[PDB]
Design a protein around this nucleic acid. Structure first.
Ligand SMILES: *O[C@H]1[C@@H](O)[C@H](n2cnc3c(=O)[nH]c(N)nc32)O[C@@H]1COP(=O)(O)OP(=O)(O)OP(=O)(O)O
Lengths: 329, 919
RNA sequence: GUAAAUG
DNA sequence: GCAATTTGCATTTACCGACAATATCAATACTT
DNA sequence: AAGTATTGATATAAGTAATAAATGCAAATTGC
């Protein structure tokens, strides 16, 4: 009973800040059918969903009319978009909130003291069953916020103190390639490493067909992205748009040391590990050459290193008697 | 022992001269010791300490720092010798058939000669010296200069070794050699450090390398640091043994070596260049060509006279300065000792983000004030330490020139171009009889030191006579009294002159008195004076005191009156800023603006200066930027409505600079530049000063490109690769450069003539300093030299020089296709394109023009006939008188500069009788 | 980059 | 032609949220 | 045809954000 905004209604909007939205109920229902969000969340009523950068609100309206959660939250700052949301969704059971998702204090206030939005806490053993987050960070400038949330996954401070929370994330098509890079690929970086360490991802959708050549084929065939044409997004000037599913997983290592090791190793992503150990500290090359008894790891490049090998290197760095203080940074 | 008091005690000039010769002979050795460079003494000290430690058999690391350095040198030497062996192997072979080898020989020729032994000294000292150089401590230094500084130090060693017997080293070569040598040092740098095992918590002993490469991330950009081990950090900090090789520049103790060549002069054992060229090859090439031709002898003489005057420190003023410094709190200029920065109380996090950012800005303001006070305290402490060290000695000051020609001292810490304290702590070494006129000139100097230089000479002397009682009281009690000198415009020079005049008045006969204090003679708005002299504008000449008169007109007072009138009419309408600023506009608040308007200070600089003068009043204390910008707008309106003859010359110079910066050589550009359609501009505005110094403006587009080095790829810019000129910079910088070159030329002529006459001459840009007895002779010399400089038409000579040097140049420009003149250009291009068989381009047109010039310039008579028969793009324009009137395809245009603006009538000789022209 | 000094 | 748009004299000193960014990869260019 | 080399682009990290609103200096210069 929530009316989806019409393409003409979006057409009247003047300021988008560079955030590409989608206005196709067909594409949304296909994506939802692929995702099968009712499997993990078998109470439609008990669900409480918080959204970031909702924008036009077509996705929010479709989600509400399909699942009917207990409380749906929209966090937007744009004046024109807020006016449009209030005008179109007046009298609706949906709740409209005016804040800034960029500001850290927003969530802390909203959950801690005024408690307009009270979430629910879950154990870390299994997937959360009450709290869901759906974000849209397709704006080209704001791609750093995605890395900030990725780090917050490990730090267990932003919203993952409630448990492991599934993220439905709209991303610029280039950031999706940066994150979802298998070892050995050209687009592998510390973003890919942290993604692999903290979450498992499945590229749900992507607009441009030619872009798919930038990923790994064996992962593409299993993921089965729901491809749609580029004319389906209202601002057609921007780069293609992708969607990913972000499920946090358990991990056992010291986050600060792992971050330091990965960051100082992937500055040189093509030099063989026979020499790049020296960048970590004084005599690091000698110490790691003495400790490591595997020739294959001694010859592999950091771009080809897997997360298990990085964790092993972190353990050896901890075992180093003369390790420098990472906290100086 | 105190040489100054010995000199004053010696009665007769004959034994004074004998004592001077003895003092010179004695201080020769001290000067050599002071200029000594620690590239051999450091090695000898390290060897001696190593041998004594080995003989003893028991030592500790704190005193074994030199032993460790000796070990590092011993381990390094074979590797650098091996590198020299590789250099000789590659260089000796005559064959030049490279087989795709990874070996690099460009640096090899650079570091072949002498780096086999002394080099480890430089690597060790420089790497140790840059300890926390660019906040790499987070210990460590940025690799950016670490390779460069090592390379630069090596180059200086070559230059310093040559004077005792590839002139400019490329940035690429310097970075390469620095990188190679630092890598070699990193290889064999070892130190022993004890650690604790994590598993068993047991102590471990294990050597580790000293210097380690690394990278850091700052806002998403790699940086490439080079760090140092904790044990070395502790040993360096706990010993304070920097042992640097380049001594800090200090005033000399011997007469400076007279300038002979552009590279010989100044310091006795340290090389210097006649121009402060910011490593630009063109300026160095032109200067070397001029020196080889030998047409700057007058410049040499002027510099010699400027540097030949001896100085000494003023003990009486230094005592007061030391007392105030030891008190250590706020004074006239000394900010005082701020022990610790106080953190302002912060509002709670529950407060509004606007309040939080207000608190953050408050903390930023406090931190900025603390840092500024810390820096000023450090500068004052350095200056006071140098003054205390040099007190009682015989100072000297060798001088140098920037690319225009203005004279600066070679010692940047303690000189007479410093602040008021710096000028006050200095007096002339020679003592000259006051004579009949010295008393009057000293009184005038005090009168215009207080800032009352807008009054005639008799009124100034009367003011000094009125305030002689306060002079005596202040000189008797510098502190614990009325502190009258504190109210002066320049308190420290005022205090020194107060001491001087009090000692004079205590004497019965002032004429017999022997004075040392210099006397300041200055001109007002030297830029306006030079523009008036160039344009022959009587209307401005009478305004800025060129024409003889009895009342000294004040341009600052006139513009202050105009600004007051503007603010009055604005306050009548009812502007709040007008009400606030209407009555508080003074001479000083616009002095800098009007003085530097000729200098080319833009709107932002004007606002900064006017706010700087507004702040001490504290009338607008919190923030005066809006008042500053409004007042600058009004002051600019006043200056525009006041000056027109200056502006005509300024506009002509700027527009000619633009046309030069948009020019194309006929011959050099014939070679393909990988662009074809769009040419690159490689010509810079060049002219010769009346003295003979050739000026080459260095403004160019400098682009940083990664250069390949052993350690990493360093992101630097190599100026040796020529680049397109920065047309906007050249256009905005030609007028002030021309005026400052004229100022320097007048300085050097006046200094040469005064030195010939036997005066002691010291100059700070416009102001010229001399003993009180020689002021009249210096004034006569100055007026004569100004007449000699401006007798000829300098702007006309400049235009002639441009047209003679830039004869065979062409300009690019866009013209409408509908023009019938452009139609004939297409007609000629149609034949031209067909003959070559391809499409005609601008490069082809320039090649055709060069071919025509080849036929025209050939001395053979038969060759000239073909040139006239050959018609090209530039051939069409040989008949068009006014190119601007004629001015859609881009077509070639000949380079024709506009004829000089109309020259008014003014006999410059008339200023010879003027007395307020320069005072 | 910030501040200061000089012209 | 048209809109926007990014700076604007010389020299010296001190200080810093920090000052010239670096690694790698492909596209064009050149040489044999 | 075989190659090899010099040039140019892009990412890197992650709270001095982004975008639009805001504002101001104007002007000589730089995009279309
Ligand atoms: O505009 C400057 C600035 O961004 C940066 N920079 C250079 N030196 C410093 C420094 O000491 N501290 C800080 N915080 N930032 C610095 O580099 C830019 C380029 O500098 P310039 O091209 O103006 O050249 P230079 O280093 O000679 O400038 P300056 O130090 O004389 O002002």
């Amino acid at each position: 009973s929530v009316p989806i905004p019409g393409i003409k209604d979006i057409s009247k909007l003047k300021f988008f800040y560079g955030f590409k939205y989608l206005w196709n109920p067909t594409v949304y229902n296909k994506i939802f059918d692929k995702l099968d969000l009712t499997k993990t969340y078998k109470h439609p009523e008990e669900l409480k969903v918080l959204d970031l950068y909702p924008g036009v609100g077509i996705q929010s309206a479709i989600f509400y009319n399909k699942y009917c959660p207990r409380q749906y939250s929209l966090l937007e700052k744009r004046s024109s978009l807020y006016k449009f949301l209030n005008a179109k969704f007046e009298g609706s059971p949906l709740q409209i909130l005016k804040r800034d998702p960029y500001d850290w204090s927003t969530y802390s206030n909203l959950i801690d003291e005024e408690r307009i939005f009270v979430p629910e806490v879950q154990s870390s053993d299994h997937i959360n069953d009450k709290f869901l987050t759906v974000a849209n960070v397709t704006g080209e400038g704001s791609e750093g916020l995605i890395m900030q949330w990725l780090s917050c996954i490990g730090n267990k401070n932003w919203l993952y103190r409630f448990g492991k929370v599934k993220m439905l994330l709209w991303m610029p098509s280039t950031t999706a390639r940066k994150l979802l890079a298998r070892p050995g690929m050209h687009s592998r970086s510390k973003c890919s490493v942290v993604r692999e360490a903290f979450t498992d991802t499945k590229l749900i959708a992507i607009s441009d067909a030619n872009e798919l050549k930038g990923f790994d084929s064996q992962c593409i065939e299993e993921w089965d992205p729901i491809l749609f044409s580029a004319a389906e997004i209202w601002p057609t000037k921007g780069k293609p748009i992708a969607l990913v599913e972000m499920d946090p997983i358990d991990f056992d290592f010291d986050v600060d040391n792992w971050d330091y090791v990965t960051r100082h190793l992937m500055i040189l992503k093509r030099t063989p590990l026979n020499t790049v150990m020296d960048s970590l500290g004084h005599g690091g090359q000698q110490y790691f050459n003495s400790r490591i008894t595997d020739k294959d790891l001694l010859k592999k490049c950091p771009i080809d290193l897997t997360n298990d090998e990085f964790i092993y290197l972190t353990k050896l760095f901890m075992e180093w008697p003369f390790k420098p203080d990472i906290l100086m940074d | 022992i105190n040489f100054f008091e010995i000199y004053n005690s010696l009665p007769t000039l004959e034994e004074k001269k004998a004592f001077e010769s003895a003092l010179n002979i004695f201080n020769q050795d001290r000067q050599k010791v002071l200029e000594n460079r620690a590239t051999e003494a450091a090695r000898e000290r390290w060897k001696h300490d190593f041998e004594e430690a080995k003989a003893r058999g028991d030592i500790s690391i704190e005193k074994n720092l030199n032993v460790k350095l000796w070990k590092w040198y011993n381990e390094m030497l074979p590797l650098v010798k091996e590198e020299i062996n590789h250099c000789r192997s590659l260089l000796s072979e005559k064959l030049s058939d490279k087989k795709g080898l990874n070996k690099v020989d460009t640096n090899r020729l650079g570091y072949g000669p002498y780096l086999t032994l002394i080099d480890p000294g430089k690597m060790c000292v420089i790497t140790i010296l840059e300890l926390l150089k660019l906040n790499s401590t987070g210990e460590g230094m940025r690799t950016a200069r670490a390779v460069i500084s090592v390379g630069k130090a090596i180059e200086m060693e070559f230059r310093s070794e040559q004077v005792l017997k590839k002139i400019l080293w490329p940035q690429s070569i310097r970075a390469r050699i620095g990188s190679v040598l630092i890598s070699m040092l990193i290889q064999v740098a070892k130190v022993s450090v004890q650690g604790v095992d994590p598993v068993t918590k047991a102590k471990v002993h294990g050597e580790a390398p000293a210097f380690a490469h690394g990278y850091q991330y700052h806002n998403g950009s790699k940086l490439g640091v080079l760090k140092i081990h904790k044990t070395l950090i502790r040993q360096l900090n706990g010993e304070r043994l920097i042992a640097s090789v380049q001594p800090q520049l200090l005033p000399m103790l011997v007469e400076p070596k007279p300038w002979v060549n552009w590279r010989s002069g100044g310091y006795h054992y340290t090389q210097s260049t006649l121009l402060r060229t910011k490593d630009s090859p063109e300026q160095v090439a032109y200067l070397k060509a001029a020196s080889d031709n030998g047409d700057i002898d007058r410049v040499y003489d002027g510099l010699n006279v400027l540097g030949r005057t001896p100085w000494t420190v003023n003990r009486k003023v230094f005592d007061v300065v030391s007392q105030v410094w030891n008190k250590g709190e706020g004074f006239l200029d000394i900010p005082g000792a701020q022990d610790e920065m106080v953190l302002p109380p912060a509002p709670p996090k529950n407060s509004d983000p606007s309040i939080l950012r207000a608190w953050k800005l408050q903390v930023k303001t406090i931190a900025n004030k603390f840092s500024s006070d810390r820096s000023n305290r450090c500068d004052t402490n350095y200056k006071l330490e140098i003054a205390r060290a040099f007190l009682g000695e015989k100072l000297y000051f060798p001088h140098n020139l920037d690319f225009r020609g203005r004279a600066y001292p070679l010692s940047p810490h303690f000189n007479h171009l410093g602040n008021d304290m710096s000028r006050g702590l200095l007096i002339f070494w020679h003592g000259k009889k006051l004579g009949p006129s010295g008393l009057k000139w000293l009184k005038i100097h005090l009168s215009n030191l207080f800032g009352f230089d807008k009054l005639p000479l008799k009124d100034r002397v009367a003011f000094t006579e009125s305030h002689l009682q306060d002079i005596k009281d202040s000189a008797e009690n510098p502190l614990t009294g009325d502190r009258w000198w504190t109210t002066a415009d320049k308190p420290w020079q005022a205090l020194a002159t107060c001491f001087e005049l009090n000692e004079v008045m205590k004497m019965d006969n002032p004429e017999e008195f022997i004075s040392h204090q210099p006397v300041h003679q200055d001109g007002t708005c030297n830029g306006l004076q030079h523009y008036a002299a160039l344009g022959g504008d009587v209307e401005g000449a009478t305004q800025v005191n060129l024409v003889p008169s009895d009342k000294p007109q004040d341009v600052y007072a006139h513009v202050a009156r105009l600004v007051q009138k503007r603010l009055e009419i604005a306050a009548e309408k009812g502007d709040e800023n007008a009400k606030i600023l209407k009555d508080k506009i003074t001479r000083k608040v616009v002095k800098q603006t009007v003085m530097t308007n000729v200098y080319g200070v833009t709107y932002v600089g004007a606002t900064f200066q006017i706010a700087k003068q507004l702040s001490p009043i504290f009338d607008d204390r919190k923030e005066s930027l809006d008042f500053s910008k409004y007042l600058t707008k009004h002051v600019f309106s006043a200056i525009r409505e006041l000056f027109h003859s200056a502006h005509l010359i300024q506009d002509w110079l700027g527009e000619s600079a633009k046309r030069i910066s948009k020019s194309i050589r006929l011959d050099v550009d014939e070679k393909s530049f990988k662009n074809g359609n769009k040419p690159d501009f490689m010509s810079s505005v060049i002219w010769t000063t009346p003295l003979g110094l050739p000026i080459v403006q260095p403004y160019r587009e400098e682009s940083k490109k990664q250069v390949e080095t052993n350690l990493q790829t360093v992101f630097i810019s190599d100026p040796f690769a020529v680049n397109p000129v920065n047309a906007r910079r050249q256009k905005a910088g030609l007028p002030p450069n021309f005026i400052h070159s004229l100022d320097a030329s007048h300085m050097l002529l006046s200094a040469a003539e005064c030195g010939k006459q036997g005066l002691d001459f010291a100059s700070v840009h416009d102001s010229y300093w001399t003993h009180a007895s020689d002021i009249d002779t210096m004034n006569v010399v100055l007026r004569e030299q100004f007449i000699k400089l401006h007798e000829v038409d300098l702007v006309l000579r400049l235009k002639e020089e441009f047209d003679q040097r830039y004869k065979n140049y062409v300009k690019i420009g866009k013209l409408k296709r509908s023009t019938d003149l452009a139609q004939k250009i297409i007609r000629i291009r149609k034949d031209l394109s067909r003959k070559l068989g391809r499409s005609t381009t601008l490069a082809d047109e320039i090649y055709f023009e060069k071919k025509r010039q080849e036929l025209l310039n050939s001395p053979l008579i038969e060759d000239r006939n073909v040139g006239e028969k050959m018609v090209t793009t530039v051939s069409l324009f040989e008949d068009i008188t006014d190119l601007d009137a004629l001015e859609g395809m881009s077509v070639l245009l000949p380079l024709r500069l506009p004829e000089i603006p109309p020259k008014g009538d003014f006999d410059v000789t008339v200023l010879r009788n003027s007395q307020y022209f320069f005072s």
